Structure formats: C-alpha cells, structure tokens
C-alpha cells in the first residue's frame, strides 16, 4: 500500500543511500571501506594493541585471511545497499502517481548505487551472489552486470553533472563516470578504455570540477564538496546520535577514532586521541620530496609534536601510548581534529564530521593520463599528470609513463582505498607486496590473494550454493 506513492518512493530512494555510511561501524564490526584495502598495500600498518586486536585486519594485511576469522560487516552493508536498491525498482513497477522524468531519475540513482555496492563485494571477494529482485556469479560475470547497468544509467540521461548545496551526496553523472572508469580499469577491459577516456574528458571540460590549489585544504571540513569533489559519503557531528547500540543512524564516522594516537593529550596541536590503528609507515613519509605538500597532509608526525612541546616545557612533558607497529606518524587526512565532533549528542567516538572522499578530480586527471598512455585516445597526458604533480608543490615536470602515473596515484591517494587495487590491476602487487624488514608482513602477494575468503557463515548458509575462493 505505502510504497505506491511518489512521496513514499522518494523516502525509499533516500533509504537506498544509507548503507554508504555504515561499514566503518555496523553489524558489530569496524570495516571502514578505504582502510580495508589500504591495510593490504604498502602505505600503512594495521596497529591496535597487538596482531590479535582486529585480528581479521592483521590476517588480510599478511595475505593469510581465513573464512572463520574474516571481515563480515562490509559484506552485510553491501548486500543491505543492494536490497534497498532492488526495493525501489520493485516499488516503481506498482507506482500510482510517478511521472516518466521522476521514474527515470529514481532508477538512475538506485541502479548506480546498486553497482557501487556490488563494486565493494566484487573487489574484495570477486565471485559473489548476484540479484536485481528480493546466483553465485564469477567476478567476470558480475563485471558484465555492473558495466551494463552503468551504460543504462548513462543512457537514461537524467543525472546532473554536479549537484547543488541542498543535494550533495546524490548520484551524479560525474560520479557514474568515475565508477565506470574504476570498474573498467580494474577489469583491464581495454574494449571500454576509449569510452572511459571520453567520460574523463567530459569531467575535465566541466568548469565545475578542478583541483583545489592547496592540497592541505582538501580534507578540512571546509574542503567537503569543494570544486575537487566528485563524490563523498556524508558524515556529520551537528546533533549526531550514532552510538554503540545505534550504528546505522545518519550521524558521524568512527574512522578518526580508529586511526588517531592512543591516549593522545586531547587538544595538543588541535588533535584528539583514538585507538592507534593504521599508523602511517615511516617509508610512506620518506618517499615524498621535502616540498611535496602531500607529505605533511598525509603523514602527521605526532611524536615530533610532543618532542617539540617537551623541549619548550621540560616541566609539562607529554607522551601518547604507542601501540603495535607505532611509527610516530598517523594519517592526517582522517585524523581526529579537536572540534570535529564538538556538536554530537551521543558517543563522541562514533560521531566525527569527516566525510569519506570517494572520487576527487585528481583521480579524473590521472585516469585520463593513464588511458591516453594505454592508447585509448589522443590527449595531453603530460599536462594532466603534471597538473596533479605541480598542485603538490613539485617544480620538476615528469613524463607520462605508466610507472610515473601509477606512482603519482601512490603519492596522491594514501589512505583513500586506491593503492591495493592499483597494484593488482597493473600487475605490480606480486613484486611490491613482499616480506618487510620489520617482520610484520611475512608473506608475498600472489594471484590467489586477489579475492578474500568468503565468510564461513555465508558458505554454511548457502548449503553448497557458494563455492569458497581458492585464496
């Protein structure tokens, strides 16, 4: 009865977006979607009390995940998203008073969201259940369903290129273009490279997408939905009431609590404390040139801050509590900043206002450079690469080789859930992700590690329906 009117179907479309903001704290797990890939690359450690604190993260990082000790929150969030998208398509088949223009717009949002949620399970697990109404496909078969759905959304021709202040967070054409380029490039689907390049060029031609001149302004609260932002997942502290017992409410994010220094003295250098997950590797700080603005915007030297403080006051000496894999560096982009939870009305730990940046225009420029270099089309790959390189303060221009473009991504997107997928899709993962001199990673990546083990509870529930990955 209820989901028969346009007004109520709009409420269902809004509901289909909610699982976007769940995985950082949902289904009694912390599975923040960016960190779940970055812990498997070469930029961060895992941290916590020990290798048994969030053990599933430590196992994934060392390519020894097991089905009975695996992340499961993200899986449940992805399929909750898929189910809510399917509900809207079902409701539209039984719709009283929905105009043709509105039907197509509602459809464009939920089909694009559905591909976005399938992309989470496609990337992490590959060979997973598929449904468009409320069965295990191969990764290659799921790619086929995903890319065809994006083609249909693009062909509806109803999404705006950019949203306005009232609706930031809604699906846009630019968001769909970026998701299209993402899955096309991860699949190595050279048949679609020229189309993906044409889409990147359309975003580049828009005067309403560009680089922020100062990379240090991006991850500030004032940098949310800037000229650089193509897509973010919205989080707020203002009267936010996300809680241990209320993880699903539209509130703040847990991410800053997870990755800020344990028992930091709150307010020192306008940073707050967290649980000491995902310290930034010393090697990440060292790979930057001194005049690369990304170095300090990525790597916050918490220990140097206290060393300075203690020199300037030998009376009032401070420390934080170093945890497993401590380096003295934390991920500045999503660090707990004094004031960024100040208006929350529940658990301070779960209500940070930091939006999760998904697609930034520097990714558009690097995607276009790489696609041009791979022979998708003619275009100024060198200009596109160096707009990003030079925005970071670097004076030397670099040639648009594949290695140079892949390394610029590496410098550009630490902690943003890009590097692991870039290593795998370019064939670099086997040679880069090898045992370290710390004894932290003790295994080498190999092609069997591309798809994680499916959770044992899902294998058990499918009654032989779900074939476990050979990981």
Residue 207 vs 439, nearer CB to Na ion: 207
Give the up-direction half-sphere exposure of residue 430: CA atoms within 13 A in the CB hemisphere: 6
CB of 384 to Na ion, least distance (A): 11
> How many CB atoms within 10 Å of residue 397?
12
Three-state SS string over 179-235 comes to HHHHHHHHHCCHHHHHHHHHHHHHHHHCCCCCCCCCHHHCCCHHHCCCCCEEEEECC
> Shortest Cβ distance from residue 209 to Na ion (Å)?
4
Residue 233 main-chain phi, psi, to 5 deg: -95, 120
CB-nearest residue to Na ion = 209
| Nearer Cβ to Na ion (149/206) | 206
Contact footprint for Na ion (CB under 5 A)? 204, 206, 209-210
Q: Which of 17, 209 has the CB closer to Na ion? A: 209
Q: How far is the CB of 207 from Na ion (least distance, A)?
A: 6
Q: Decide: 242 and 351 in contact? Cβ < 8 Å.
A: yes
Q: What is the crossing angle of helices 100-124 and 73-93, to 10°?
A: 160
The CA distances from residue 352 to 158, 254, 346, in Å, are 33, 7, 11
Q: Which CA distances in Å does 85 have to 158, 256, 261?
A: 18, 29, 38
Helix axes 361-373 and 381-391, enclosed angle (nearest 10): 150
Shortest approach of Na ion to residue 370 CB, angstroms? 18
The DSSP result for 387-417, as a single string, is: HHHHHTT--S-----HHHHHHHHHHH-TTTT
- Given the complex with Na ion, which of 150 and 387 has the nearer CB atom? 387
CB-CB contact of 236 with 311 (8 Å): no
**Complex with Na ion: residue 82 or 365, whichever CB lies closer:** 365
User: Minimum Å distance from CB 365 to Na ion?
Assistant: 9
Q: Which two tokens stand for residue 416?
A: 């943003």
Q: CA 456 to CA 25: how far, in whole Å?
A: 21
Provide the terminal-to-terminal Cα distance of the chain, rounded to the nearest Å.
46
Beta carbon nearer to Na ion, 207 or 245: 207
Which of 204/297 has CB closer to Na ion? Answer: 204
Residue 230 or 278 with smaller CB distance to Na ion: 230
Nearer to Na ion, 35 or 369 (CB): 369
CB of 108 to Na ion, least distance (A): 22
In the complex, minimum distance from the CB of residue 401 to Na ion, in angstroms, rounded to a whole number:
24
DSSP for residue 357: E
CA distance 432 to 180: 27
CB of residue 204 to Na ion, shortest distance in Å? 5
Nearest to 21 by CA among 231, 333, 220, 179: 231
Taking the C-alpha atoms of residue 64 and residue 54, their distance in angstroms, rounded to an integer, is 14
CA pair distance 32, 344, nearest whole angstrom: 20
Q: How far is the CB of 463 from Na ion (least distance, A)?
A: 51
Between 210 and 217, CB nearer to Na ion: 210
Residue among 229 and 344 whose Cβ is closer to Na ion: 229
Nearest distance in Å: CB 81, Na ion: 30
Secondary structure in 3-state letters for 328-356: CEEEHHHCCECCCCCCCCCCHHHCECCCE
Question: Maximum CA pair distance of the chain?
Answer: 74
Output the smallest distance, CB 272 to Na ion, in A. Answer: 35
């Amino acid at each position: 009865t209820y989901f028969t009117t346009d007004e109520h179907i709009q409420e269902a479309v809004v509901a289909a977006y909610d699982p976007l903001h769940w995985p950082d704290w949902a289904f009694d797990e912390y599975n923040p979607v960016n960190l779940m890939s970055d812990i498997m690359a070469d930029d961060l450690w895992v941290g916590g009390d020990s290798k048994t604190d969030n053990q599933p993260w430590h196992l994934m990082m060392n390519f020894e995940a097991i089905p009975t000790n695996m992340i499961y929150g993200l899986w449940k969030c992805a399929y909750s998203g898929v189910k809510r998208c399917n509900d809207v398509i079902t409701y539209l088949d039984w719709a009283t008073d929905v105009t043709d223009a509105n039907r197509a717009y509602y459809e464009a949002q939920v089909i694009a969201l559905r591909v976005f949620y399938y992309n989470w399970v496609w990337k992490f697990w590959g060979n997973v259940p598929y449904f468009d109404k409320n069965e295990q496909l191969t990764a290659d078969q799921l790619y086929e369903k995903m890319v065809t759905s994006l083609e249909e959304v693009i062909q509806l021709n109803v999404l705006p290129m950019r949203e306005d202040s009232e609706n930031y967070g809604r699906v846009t054409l630019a968001m769909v273009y970026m998701l299209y380029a993402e899955i096309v490039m991860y699949q190595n689907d050279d048949s679609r490279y020229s189309t993906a390049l044409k889409y990147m060029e359309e975003i580049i031609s828009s005067p309403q997408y560009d680089l922020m001149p100062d990379y240090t302004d991006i991850f500030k609260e004032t940098g949310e939905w800037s000229i650089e932002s193509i897509f973010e997942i919205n989080y707020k502290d203002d009267n936010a009431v996300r809680d241990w017992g209320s993880p699903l409410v539209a509130g703040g994010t847990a991410l800053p609590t997870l990755i800020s220094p344990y028992i930091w003295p709150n307010g020192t250098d306008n940073h707050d404390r967290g649980w000491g997950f995902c310290p930034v590797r010393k090697e990440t700080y060292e790979r930057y040139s001194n005049n690369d603005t990304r170095r300090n915007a990525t790597c916050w030297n918490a220990q140097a801050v206290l060393d300075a403080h203690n020199a300037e006051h030998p009376g009032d000496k401070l420390s934080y509590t170093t945890r497993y894999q401590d380096t003295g560096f934390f991920l500045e982009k999503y660090a707990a900043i004094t004031g960024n939870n100040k208006d929350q009305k529940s658990s301070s730990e779960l209500n940070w206002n930091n939006n999760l940046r998904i697609y930034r225009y520097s990714e558009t420029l690097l995607n276009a450079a790489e696609l041009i270099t791979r022979g998708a089309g003619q275009g100024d790959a060198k200009k596109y690469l160096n707009l990003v390189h030079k925005r970071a303060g670097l004076v030397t221009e670099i040639e648009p080789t594949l290695d140079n473009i892949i390394e610029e991504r590496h410098l550009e997107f630490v902690g943003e859930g890009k590097r692991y997928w870039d290593l795998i899709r370019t064939g670099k993962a086997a040679s880069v992700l090898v045992p370290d001199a710390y004894g932290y990673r003790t295994n080498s990546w190999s092609s069997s590690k591309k798809y994680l083990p499916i959770p044992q509870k899902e294998i058990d529930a499918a009654k032989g329906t779900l074939v476990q990955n050979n990981y």
